[PDB]
């Protein structure tokens, strides 16, 4: 990592990250076969099986109405992902595709099937509960007496049907579209097999095998539905087409100039992540779109907002910039600390006590009025009035782009005051 | 469904939906009776019962501090729903009401009780763990020795207290107010019985018996608390007063006009769902307020914003409109794809590659500069630079309202530039 404190606009740009951008989806259609639980009935008292059979029947009948119907659409990453998943889900819903998938999965536990849409999917059968129900449960409950005294069947059924109950709970809570791949929809072995079956290069396979909990959080599951006795649901694993490209995170604080008790401040809107898919800067505003795991940053291209390559001029000279740079201006600012990945930049004004100090020396020093950058090497704790912030313990290359603050030269007495999405090259000439 | 692309403001309006508006609440007060678990004690080692008895005691002790106290209020749908629920919760908290409810539920498993507030609630007793604990859990634990060798009661207790433990976990995680009715608070049989007991017409009963997976999400549960040995909590099922009235979703993209490298664009802020409760348009700004399940759209009237019927002029002619139509204007636009329920409208500007193509033909065509509407029949995939979007597979009636873009006639060289809240009728004349 390498963090540069741009003093002109009072911002911090942290480079040295590496992109992992999800570009596509890979469909793994699981067919959890339950069996003929509906035909089996119990009329005696609670015998450790009638209660569990009733719970299984309730789950199966509850799954019928939680079919993941077509959404309302949108523009965010989750809306595009849901639409893309439902596009293949509706093709699967047709009788021909489901019949072919079940037929090919009847003999073997895995299929590589091409749908009528032209997409290739991996069909997985997890029919372990069905085998137990058909072989053991029906044999012991040939009659209507469910009070078998072996007690083996009760605990075995409790163990086998746990995954089905968890799947039902997740799909009912999430209305058929779970937000992430849990440990119940697709286990570790199935995840490894699906990754090994994916059509992708060796480096992406290695990266996705190392970070299994970031592949379980970028994907999701969609419930095709209950056909006959089989609950069929698809899992959309991510495919990271763009990998190992430079990224940088930009954080901003309100830079202020004041006189006679009147302030004038600017804060950059262009905070968040920037990456480069292929010769085109992509800007992610929301911090929930991109998640960092080490030096790698995982992002979704659906939420990416394309930005021109000229946007790099915002980090060089905004006073005489050619590309219009976005700044929100105001007066009577807000004192706050923005924790950069390496250090932290603090901007406190008016009557606010501000200090930095380590854990073994005490209060190292006080902050002069105006925003300041604090590395994690020269300080360990930042105090703002009474609030205490603990800085990071990561190491990196800290630089300071020396210069004059821009807001120091824009007449702090009175300013045009353009707040929401106003540039600087033309709005504040 | 039927989607019309208005080219005057470059926005897609999709009609043909049917409202399901939650207008009221129905209270189902569950009294989960646990028993005299506190009196029982185990002094031996782990005997498959001491561990579970300790877990039950810990859950019961934890439930004391997670009482759903009165909230801080608010203006959203969740705040109003919480306040309405707590209004009956405080009435139930009185000793007379809870004593009467428990007295009527002592003999029968269901009650229809009228509170002193005047509201009518359905009292349900799920006292299955209590019976086992009282008679045949305690029969073998007359002494302090919990190491019974039959081993059947251990697994039976594990089966019986699962619902209680799940309820405790949900109420502790959600601080007493769960966001939705899970499978543990109210099972499918109890949900169906409560629906059958509700005072509503046959149409609503059929609709919400075919859509239990959305009724479980539109409701919630509030914990009254632990009285004696009984955990009392109410579930607030939704009552859909206004049903099957026309609704339409409006989505917008930035319509732009540019010259000499200078842009000027407008985007409609009034995106989202519109419905008609009774002769009055209601607008839902947040996309999480309304959820579509097929052609029906389920909404909450608490989050609705009343809008005058004159707002229909926003979809006919905004250049010479009488009703003030809200637009957010700006330059230096954003290239993005808004996925309409039927098709998708793409607005890409500056140096951004834009194309559409099917899955078989390849790249069908290249999109000219300016926002364009793409149906799901003439194209199957939309490519913007590197990002790829898959269109929906639903069928409907697509229309294009031909005309001239409004922003094309408002001097793209320089424009008043009001973004957050201004109307095109008398701010951008």
């Amino acid at each position, epitope marked *: 990592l390498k963090e540069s404190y741009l003093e002109e606009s009072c911002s911090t740009i942290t480079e040295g990250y590496l992109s992992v951008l999800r570009t596509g989806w890979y469909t793994n259609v699981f067919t959890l076969e339950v069996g003929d639980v509906e035909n089996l009935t119990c009329t005696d008292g609670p015998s450790l099986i009638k209660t569990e059979l009733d719970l299984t029947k309730s789950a199966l009948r509850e799954l019928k109405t939680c079919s993941a119907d077509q959404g309302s659409g949108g523009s965010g990453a989750t809306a595009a992902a849901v639409t893309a998943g439902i596009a293949i889900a509706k093709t699967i819903r047709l009788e021909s595709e489901v019949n072919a998938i079940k037929g090919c999965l009847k003999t073997t536990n895995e299929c590589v099937s091409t749908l009528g849409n032209g997409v290739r999917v991996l069909a997985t059968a997890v029919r372990e509960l069905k085998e137990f129900v058909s072989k053991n449960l029906t044999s012991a409950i040939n009659k209507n007496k469910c009070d078998i005294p072996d007690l083996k069947m009760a605990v075995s059924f409790s163990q086998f049907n746990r995954r089905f109950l968890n799947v039902v709970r997740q799909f009912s809570d999430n209305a058929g579209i779970t937000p992430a791949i849990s440990l119940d929809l697709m286990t570790d072995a199935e995840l490894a097999r699906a990754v090994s079956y994916m059509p992708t290069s060796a480096g992406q396979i290695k990266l996705m095998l190392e970070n299994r909990c970031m592949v379980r959080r970028k994907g999701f599951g969609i419930l095709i539905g209950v056909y006959g006795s089989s609950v069929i649901y698809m899992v959309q694993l991510p495919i990271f087409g763009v990998i190992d490209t430079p990224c940088w995170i930009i954080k901003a604080a309100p830079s202020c100039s004041e006189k006679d008790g009147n302030y004038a401040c600017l804060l950059r809107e262009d905070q968040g992540w920037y990456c480069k898919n292929a010769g085109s800067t992509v800007y992610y505003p929301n911090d929930k779109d991109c998640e960092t795991r080490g030096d790698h940053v995982f992002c979704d291209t659906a939420a990416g907002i394309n930005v021109a*390559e000229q946007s790099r001029e915002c980090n060089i000279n905004i006073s005489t910039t050619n590309y219009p740079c976005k700044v929100s201006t105001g007066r009577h600012p807000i004192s706050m600390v923005a924790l950069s990945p390496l250090g932290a930049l603090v901007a406190c004004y008016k009557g606010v006590s501000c200090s930095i100090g380590s854990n073994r020396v005490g209060i190292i020093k006080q902050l002069p009025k105006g925003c300041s950058y604090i590395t994690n090497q020269d300080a360990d704790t930042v105090t703002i009035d009474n609030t205490v912030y603990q800085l990071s313990k990561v190491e990196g290359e800290q630089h300071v782009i020396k210069g004059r603050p821009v807001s120091s030269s824009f007449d702090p007495i009175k300013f045009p005051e353009c707040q929401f999405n106003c540039a600087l090259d033309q709005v504040f000439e | 469904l039927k989607e019309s692309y208005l080219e005057e403001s470059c926005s897609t309006i999709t009609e043909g939906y049917l409202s399901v508006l939650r207008t009221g609440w129905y209270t189902n007060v569950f009294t989960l009776e646990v028993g005299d678990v506190e009196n029982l004690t185990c002094t031996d080692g782990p005997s498959l019962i001491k561990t579970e008895l300790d877990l039950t005691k810990s859950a019961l002790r934890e439930l004391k501090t997670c009482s759903a106290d009165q909230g801080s209020g608010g203006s959203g749908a969740t705040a109003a729903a919480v306040t309405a629920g707590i209004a009956i919760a405080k009435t139930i908290r009185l000793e007379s009401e809870v004593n009467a409810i428990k007295g009527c539920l002592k003999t029968t498993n269901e009650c229809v009780s009228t509170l002193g507030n005047g509201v009518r609630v359905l009292a349900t007793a799920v006292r299955e763990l209590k019976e086992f604990v009282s008679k045949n859990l305690t029969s073998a634990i007359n002494k302090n020795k919990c190491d019974i060798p039959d081993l059947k009661m251990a697994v039976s207790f594990s089966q019986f207290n699962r619902r209680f433990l799940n309820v405790v976990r949900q109420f502790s995680d959600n601080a007493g107010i769960t966001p939705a009715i899970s499978l543990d608070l109210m099972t499918d049989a109890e949900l169906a019985r409560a629906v059958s007991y509700m005072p509503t017409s046959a149409g609503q009963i059929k609709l919400m018996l075919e859509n239990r997976c959305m009724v479980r999400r539109k409701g919630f549960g509030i914990l009254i608390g632990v009285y004696g040995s009984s955990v009392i909590y109410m579930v607030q099922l939704p009552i859909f007063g206004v049903i099957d009235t026309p609704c339409w979703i409006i989505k917008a993209a930035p319509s732009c006009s540019e010259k000499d490298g200078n842009y000027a664009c407008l985007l409609r802020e009034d995106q989202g769902w519109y419905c008609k409760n009774a002769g009055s348009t209601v607008y839902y700004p947040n996309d999480k307020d309304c959820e579509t399940r097929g052609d029906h759209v389920f909404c909450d009237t608490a989050a609705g914003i009343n809008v005058a019927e004159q707002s229909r002029e926003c979809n006919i002619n905004i250049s010479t409109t009488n009703y003030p139509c809200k637009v957010s204007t700006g330059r230096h636009p954003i290239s993005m794809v808004a996925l309409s329920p039927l098709g998708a409208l793409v607005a890409c500007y500056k140096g951004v590659s834009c194309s559409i193509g099917s899955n078989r*033909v*390849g790249i069908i065509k290249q999109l000219p500069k300016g926002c364009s509407y793409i149906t799901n029949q003439d194209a199957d995939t939309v490519t913007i630079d590197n990002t790829v979007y898959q269109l929906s597979k639903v069928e409907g009636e697509q229309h294009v309202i031909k005309g001239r873009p409004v922003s094309s006639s408002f001097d793209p060289i320089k424009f008043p530039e009001c973004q957050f809240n201004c109307a095109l009728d008398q701010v951008f004349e």
Partner: single-chain antibody
Amino acid sequence: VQLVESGGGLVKPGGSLRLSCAASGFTFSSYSMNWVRQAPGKGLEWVSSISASSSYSDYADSAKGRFTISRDNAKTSLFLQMNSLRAEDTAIYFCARARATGYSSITPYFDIWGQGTLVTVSSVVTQTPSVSGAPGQRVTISCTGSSSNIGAGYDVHWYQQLPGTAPKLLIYDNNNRPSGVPDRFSASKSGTSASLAITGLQAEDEADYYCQSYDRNLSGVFGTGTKVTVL
């Protein structure tokens, strides 16, 4: 935008040779790069890869360890060092950019190629050996592959190479088409085989056509090379 090549000099067998490729006109730090060698008379062959930050690098399963690849983003330069090259390494080497849509499968396509340099000493996909005909009508070229290259879900790309000319991307991502290519070229992939159809070919279409897909075993396999002729 172009990739100047250098370093293709005569070398004795068992020696070392350094080839440099300088790319001008694009962000060199965001594009993966590749080496493709073509023997004097045979088809194109993949050599080595390099990512956008030199963290992942894959090699063809014929010169692992023997060759090495590196890049420096400071001056936007790339280098290939060949150590102890054999007598079969006499070929024209092309430094090629790489782009991957990644929507369905990750199969990079070599959109921009360098002129290449000549080096001399002192589950493979296959397609039709050659096609012929007359101007005016339609011709087809079929590139068949095993279950690891096209049957594994990987896409198929088609490049057209004139005699004594750097190859040019013709079809990318199954059936799409780049700018500057006439619409008379069409492509279609089915199951395990791809097909390129040329409708109403002119006299300037006389060039070799190569199909490129991705393997699970040996990455970046190229086709055997079909030659079209015009009467």
